[PDB]
Amino acid sequence: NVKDLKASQRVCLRSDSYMLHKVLENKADPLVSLMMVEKVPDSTYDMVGGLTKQIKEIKEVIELPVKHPELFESLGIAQPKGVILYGPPGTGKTLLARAVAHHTDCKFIRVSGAELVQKYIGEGSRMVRELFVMAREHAPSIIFMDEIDSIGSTRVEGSGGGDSEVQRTMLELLNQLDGFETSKNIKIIMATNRLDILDPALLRPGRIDRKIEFPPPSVAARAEILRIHSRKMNLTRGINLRKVAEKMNGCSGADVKGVCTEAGMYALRERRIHVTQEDFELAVGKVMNKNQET
Amino acid sequence: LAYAVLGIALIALGEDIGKEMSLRHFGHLMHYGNEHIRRMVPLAMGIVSVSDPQMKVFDTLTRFSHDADLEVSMNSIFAMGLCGAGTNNARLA
Amino acid sequence: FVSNSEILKPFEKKQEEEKKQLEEIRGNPLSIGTLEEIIDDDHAIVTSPTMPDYYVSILSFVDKELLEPGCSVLLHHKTMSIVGVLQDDADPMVSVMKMDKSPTESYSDIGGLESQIQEIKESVELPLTHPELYEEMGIKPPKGVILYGAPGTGKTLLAKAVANQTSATFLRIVGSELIQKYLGDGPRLCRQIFKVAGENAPSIVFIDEIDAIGTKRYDSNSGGEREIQRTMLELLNQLDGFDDRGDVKVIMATNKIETLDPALIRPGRIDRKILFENPDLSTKKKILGIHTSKMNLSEDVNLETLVTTKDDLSGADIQAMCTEAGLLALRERRMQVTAEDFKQAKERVMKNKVEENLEGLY
Amino acid sequence: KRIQSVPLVIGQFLEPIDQNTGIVSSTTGMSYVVRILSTLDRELLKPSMSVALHRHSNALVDILPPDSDSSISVMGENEKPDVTYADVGGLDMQKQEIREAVELPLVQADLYEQIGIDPPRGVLLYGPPGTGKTMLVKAVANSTKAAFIRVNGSEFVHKYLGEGPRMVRDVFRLARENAPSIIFIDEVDSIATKRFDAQTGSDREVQRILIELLTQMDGFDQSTNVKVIMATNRADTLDPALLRPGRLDRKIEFPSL
Amino acid sequence: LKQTENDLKDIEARIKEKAGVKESDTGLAHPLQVARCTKIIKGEDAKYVINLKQIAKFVVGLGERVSPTDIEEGMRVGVDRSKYNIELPLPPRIDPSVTMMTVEEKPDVTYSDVGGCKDQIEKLREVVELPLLSPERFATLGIDPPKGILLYGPPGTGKTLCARAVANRTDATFIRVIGSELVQKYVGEGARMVRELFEMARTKKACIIFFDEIDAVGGARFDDGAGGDNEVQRTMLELITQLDGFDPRGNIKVMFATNRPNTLDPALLRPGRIDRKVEFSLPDLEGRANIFRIHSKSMSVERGIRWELISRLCPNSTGAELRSVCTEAGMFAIRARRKVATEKDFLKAVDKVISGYKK
């Protein structure tokens, strides 16, 4: 029947009779042009932990709206348009985005800004317009903009105004959502540690309303991050994570993940079936050596 | 029958949705044939659209003006003059 | 049933006869295609998407004076005869246009900016409302207008409000993103915009934050100067090329207008360059009044008191304040919003605007 | 039996829709919905596999070992490649670096997993090739006694829709089957230096080949017995999906000093 | 009514069409860029078999064929871009373009000014108007009328409006090519468009080809390429060649538009490219007055206007600015709700327009 058929349905039609005999599944094209879904993320607040100041702030800006929309409306506060995270590089800027997405149980959608840089008439323009349509179907979502961020957790990508032009479009679209629709279920995440990727629309109220600070790790914090990474794998059981942590100073969340992986090569050479505390001290010594560079 | 559809304007007094339902409704009337029905529709539309003006009703009536059915053109133009009343001229010019 | 059936059976009968006769000839699989051109030998050359192309006969479903090139038509198996005509598909306001159909806000909700509102009106709202002055006189209403102010503060508000009042599709273009940095992308993007707008008139081409093709150069060289200049020139030529009294209306937008050339504005089409003045005291009361409606608050709040100490502050400030005050209540685990909260939000925003020391505050 | 016999067209199975029915894409450009045999429907049925198709029948004739070919020239397999520790001595840092990254998961997947650290699945090598680097790569393959599959990475670069996606798919599959193995991507910078800033347009055809490589690369190698080694004329940046953890996790430098 | 008559037309059309399809089926079967009759059973050489394609070839040197009248077959048919040629079964038109441009037959904008553009109009009149009205005059003298005109000062000065107006009077086509769009970055594409525009131009002769902006394309050539002056010069140098290379003068007109005068090359200036330089730059006080007087005739007005006074407030203008003063003056009146225009309004519109133009 015609209500099984729909626009953009993929169907099997007889080459014999030209009769649409069954329906498969619907197809799409931006979802395979470097945009992607990642359901139920594996990041937690304990992952890049020691985020306390941020935790309460981020919960109210993102999580409460999503969890309870009616409440925001009636209270007298419209939902925040964007959050920009600003603080030291290489922390867990990306990680945080995924963590929040998981918590509310919303779809994490990773957008490569530049990819959204086709050199044909409009094909790029097309994908940008479709990015919003898709996410409106897929609501709720965290739309995380990759390539505006310098992080050692993944990689520093982006150059030029080629992700500043894209960064602008995201902010217009939030106006547009409060605008004719009068909805908002879709929150857009900036992360940056860089001044040569900003906008003047970024600096403007009614266009982006929250600037939430990302702390530096500390000796207490490093222990929390380290603890998670060592208990996703096999380790000695008398361990003092606190001891290790005091030895790292200066060292971001991404470094706490590097310490474990460098410690592991030591374990692996000496043909152990677990890592030990020892490996971790030596690993902290290795990272400190790099920071001090001549 | 002519009077039944005329009656529906008066029944649709004080009823918010129903005024909206008219726009669905006159759609139904186009499907149904018969000279009695073709004659009645400019009048049905005219009465509703001077106790609740409808841009859709004006848009339809312009087309009825240039109709090859004689009785329909007749009723459309008198009707159209009914909608433009309340002013001299407007879009009516 | 039976009452219906007596009118029904012949009314059914004339449509069915036409239909029958069509379907037999029209028998599937018939390829859909595009008319390339309609020829001097009364043929049409067609571009078939199956790769041949042909000189084709027409069966007058609707006539050739009612048919134009690039229209979609349905073509026979080999000779590609036009068996029936089709309606066009994939109109491209879903690819170069972000659409805001019947957008929100109005003139009453920011009122107190009333003198500027009449100005904007006179080019856009008013010709629709009263054609007659414009017609009789014989001079045209300005095609295009430029708004300068700031996003979420007054520029955007005026644009939502006016567009909705005229019931035209507000079609939002990102100026900077046109910005595509390779020789082929922009001038087409621009052409494709203007085309679709005029077709499906009256329509608003809203060009948001054009700052980057706001240069003019005396000489053009290379790709690095010429790209920019090609995009600028394309806007200028389309305006200069056609004239429209409101098949296409333009709102151009920029923060300040001192970054637009006066030879890109083009007097005599764009005659209005309309300013942004700050909300004054009456307006603040109003802007507030609208934003306090949506609220659940305490009765110790005095809308009046907070307006009076605010020194001539932007509509943005007023929005911001409400949004800020709700947060101070939400954190404290409550849904009531006391006066003290509004006041703290007011003190913070008022300081930042009024910071400009040793050259403003000498 | 005789009805379903040579000559034959080659296709690929995309997915099973329902019972006794499957979708294939044949290599020509014509896609068919076909039947599968009832004795091929259970216990030999993979969701994507290489198939033998009849050209009148429109039925599953045979299931093929995955190595179905392309109109691009075939890639090179070299069991025991002949460069095997030629240049040595004074490459002390680069020899040690390779050794713990590349050799150990092939001989023992199982120790990495038991520690619970991720094995390197992909490694990126940067610095010149053909001056001490290549020699080592080849030598490791030979010493671990894995097949060297030299895979021409600037040769996707075919100018047609997808022959090229079909070929990558065949190669990752065939590597896991013929484990231990090295897929060695000569110049990965050809099919993955694109859009970082809306420069390096004209790379729309490699975008499909890229997605296909990521789904095969990350979705296997969970314990690691098959290594991917990436090679670049000096260095080139890559599109963000390769570079993140779970793929190119070791990033190995050839010393300036 | 409207419905029965539409069906009656379908029925009639259709029967003729069904018969005609079957006849087309039995034989197993104008613009065109190669001919391609993909079979040819009917029809050096004494019979046609012509099919111009990479993948195969059928070649016959001899066209004509008044019986059967050739054509038919796998249909694209006529003259070839290789010159084997369907010569004269169903109208060829010399390699005729399938690549379009915007045609505006009779552009409608009649005579915006006729006073205060007095000399500039008169220049157009000699070159364009009179040679269509009488070709014999020109012939008898033995002169050939200016091939190309350059129009300077800013564009949209009412430069467009005037050009269009003479085109209406003569019933001639505006052929618009916009310089900026041509710009591709793919090998040879722009120059290819230029050749087909002139082939098409010769067919359509009595036409004003409007080339928008020479600041856009052909802006330099002193670089010796750069990637973005290299396609752009390629297009440009090709376009000149065509012009001195001959297209008919006194029919085909090319009109150039430019905002700024630093783009021009010695190649561009020369005859057979530009012959005329028409001003639309800065007019006189007497002149500004005439253009004001002219736009306000159509308008109602209430008394007390002297054009001279309005003119006085302009220290320098362009035609664009003048058009803005009358139209802006009308707007102050409509806000107050008025049909008439006043001396006060005109003054108010001068002050606004000039001051914005500054900087």
XYZ file of C-alpha atoms in Angstrom, chain C residues 87-323:
237
model
C 5.485 18.335 -12.507
C 8.974 19.341 -11.553
C 10.886 17.829 -8.612
C 13.457 18.798 -6.016
C 12.952 22.675 -6.068
C 16.134 23.792 -4.426
C 14.977 25.944 -1.415
C 16.091 22.712 0.607
C 19.730 23.078 -0.449
C 20.698 26.861 -0.665
C 18.083 28.247 1.691
C 17.319 27.703 5.407
C 13.602 28.241 5.603
C 11.650 29.868 8.354
C 8.013 29.789 7.136
C 5.756 32.206 8.935
C 8.567 33.254 11.338
C 7.693 34.599 14.810
C 7.668 37.984 16.592
C 5.996 41.235 15.664
C 6.226 44.935 16.013
C 4.192 45.224 19.212
C 6.662 42.967 21.192
C 9.623 45.329 20.920
C 7.582 48.578 20.482
C 9.177 51.767 21.615
C 11.505 51.446 18.562
C 8.434 52.835 16.736
C 10.132 55.609 14.566
C 12.631 53.038 13.018
C 9.704 50.586 12.549
C 7.908 53.020 10.248
C 11.114 53.366 8.218
C 11.467 49.521 7.627
C 7.731 49.409 6.983
C 7.827 51.899 4.247
C 10.046 49.752 2.034
C 8.686 46.235 2.987
C 5.393 45.916 4.959
C 3.461 48.926 3.556
C 3.557 48.278 -0.180
C 1.869 45.013 0.424
C -0.674 46.584 2.725
C -1.463 49.574 0.453
C -0.276 49.057 -3.173
C -1.973 52.051 -4.383
C 0.448 54.971 -3.669
C 3.298 53.061 -5.187
C 1.280 52.279 -8.338
C -0.376 55.645 -8.909
C 2.845 57.726 -8.422
C 4.780 55.315 -10.650
C 7.868 55.175 -8.422
C 8.838 51.847 -6.842
C 9.319 50.816 -3.149
C 13.011 50.116 -2.350
C 13.874 46.666 -3.441
C 16.360 46.178 -0.794
C 17.073 47.522 2.618
C 20.201 47.253 4.830
C 19.769 46.713 8.635
C 22.697 47.325 10.854
C 22.623 46.609 14.496
C 23.671 43.425 16.241
C 22.399 39.723 16.466
C 19.779 39.041 19.146
C 19.676 42.728 20.078
C 17.638 44.406 17.519
C 18.822 43.371 14.018
C 17.347 39.956 14.087
C 14.119 41.113 15.867
C 13.202 43.644 13.247
C 13.806 41.077 10.514
C 11.617 38.350 12.094
C 8.859 40.786 12.819
C 8.601 42.456 9.353
C 8.922 39.257 7.316
C 6.024 37.626 9.234
C 3.821 40.696 8.837
C 4.171 40.494 4.975
C 3.817 36.560 5.083
C 6.789 35.865 2.895
C 9.286 32.980 3.250
C 12.268 34.112 5.199
C 15.103 32.439 3.599
C 18.360 32.706 5.473
C 21.716 32.825 3.811
C 25.015 32.589 5.742
C 27.215 35.226 4.060
C 30.639 33.886 5.192
C 29.931 30.260 4.274
C 29.245 31.298 0.601
C 32.642 31.940 1.373
C 34.064 28.898 -0.455
C 37.771 29.758 -1.394
C 37.931 28.056 -4.916
C 37.032 29.259 -8.384
C 33.552 28.008 -9.199
C 31.433 27.815 -6.037
C 30.126 31.333 -5.018
C 28.768 33.123 -8.079
C 26.561 30.127 -8.975
C 25.409 29.826 -5.316
C 24.368 33.442 -5.585
C 22.572 33.000 -8.979
C 20.721 29.860 -7.731
C 19.476 31.893 -4.748
C 18.062 34.714 -6.814
C 16.467 32.382 -9.295
C 14.444 30.371 -6.836
C 13.360 33.483 -4.989
C 11.832 35.229 -8.038
C 9.985 32.055 -9.082
C 8.242 31.500 -5.750
C 7.802 35.388 -4.987
C 7.267 37.256 -2.694
C 10.342 35.964 -0.867
C 12.951 37.338 1.537
C 16.638 36.929 0.719
C 18.146 37.529 4.044
C 21.903 37.821 3.811
C 23.220 37.483 7.349
C 26.669 39.111 8.297
C 28.248 40.056 4.859
C 31.607 41.460 5.908
C 34.015 39.489 3.758
C 33.128 40.584 0.143
C 32.852 44.111 1.499
C 36.109 44.897 -0.201
C 36.473 46.446 -3.560
C 39.746 46.529 -5.433
C 40.931 48.892 -8.217
C 42.778 46.143 -10.143
C 42.079 42.330 -10.111
C 44.856 39.693 -10.436
C 45.369 35.925 -9.757
C 42.854 33.727 -7.896
C 43.446 35.311 -4.469
C 41.803 38.630 -5.171
C 39.655 37.735 -8.088
C 37.531 35.176 -6.217
C 36.383 37.640 -3.708
C 35.708 40.259 -6.362
C 33.715 37.790 -8.638
C 31.273 37.118 -5.718
C 30.862 40.867 -4.966
C 30.404 41.701 -8.682
C 27.727 38.913 -9.005
C 25.506 40.483 -6.472
C 26.035 43.925 -8.076
C 25.194 42.744 -11.568
C 22.037 40.839 -10.745
C 20.629 44.040 -9.057
C 21.776 46.177 -11.900
C 20.490 43.569 -14.475
C 16.901 43.104 -13.418
C 14.566 45.398 -11.516
C 11.772 44.204 -9.242
C 9.164 46.075 -7.216
C 8.838 42.983 -4.851
C 9.264 39.648 -6.768
C 12.596 39.585 -4.857
C 13.090 41.728 -1.706
C 16.512 41.781 0.010
C 17.469 42.395 3.511
C 21.228 42.750 3.786
C 22.671 42.600 7.224
C 25.963 43.570 8.671
C 27.101 44.842 12.091
C 28.101 48.247 10.816
C 27.697 49.498 7.359
C 31.120 51.080 7.081
C 32.428 47.762 5.792
C 30.157 47.795 2.747
C 31.123 49.846 -0.282
C 28.711 52.607 -1.311
C 29.081 51.348 -4.857
C 27.743 47.897 -3.769
C 24.706 49.403 -2.061
C 23.710 50.995 -5.315
C 21.358 53.938 -4.774
C 18.154 53.806 -6.563
C 17.212 50.268 -5.713
C 18.618 50.259 -2.126
C 17.522 53.885 -1.103
C 17.076 52.995 2.576
C 19.960 52.327 4.884
C 18.179 51.928 8.205
C 19.865 52.389 11.629
C 19.682 50.684 14.973
C 18.899 53.000 17.937
C 18.952 51.469 21.532
C 15.766 50.670 23.345
C 14.890 53.687 25.597
C 13.029 53.578 28.906
C 9.534 52.970 27.497
C 10.946 50.202 25.294
C 12.764 48.504 28.278
C 9.479 48.325 30.152
C 7.985 46.667 27.117
C 10.878 44.239 26.416
C 10.845 43.273 29.982
C 7.007 43.003 30.053
C 6.961 40.353 27.322
C 9.844 38.372 28.967
C 8.239 38.493 32.454
C 4.976 37.018 31.054
C 6.648 33.605 30.359
C 7.909 33.523 33.967
C 6.836 32.235 37.432
C 8.336 34.637 39.946
C 7.964 36.444 43.310
C 5.852 39.494 43.858
C 8.686 41.598 45.149
C 9.977 42.145 41.613
C 9.373 45.714 40.364
C 9.728 45.885 36.587
C 9.860 49.635 36.984
C 12.593 49.777 39.514
C 15.142 47.746 37.481
C 14.394 49.735 34.199
C 15.158 53.139 35.835
C 18.842 52.381 37.010
C 19.608 50.692 33.532
C 21.431 53.419 31.439
C 20.007 53.269 28.082
C 20.743 49.490 27.662
C 20.218 47.160 24.653
C 17.239 44.806 24.190
C 19.929 42.118 24.404
C 20.638 43.105 28.001
C 16.925 42.679 28.816
C 16.832 39.169 27.323
C 20.054 38.277 28.983
C 18.802 39.468 32.427
C 15.753 37.162 32.413
C 17.821 34.245 31.292
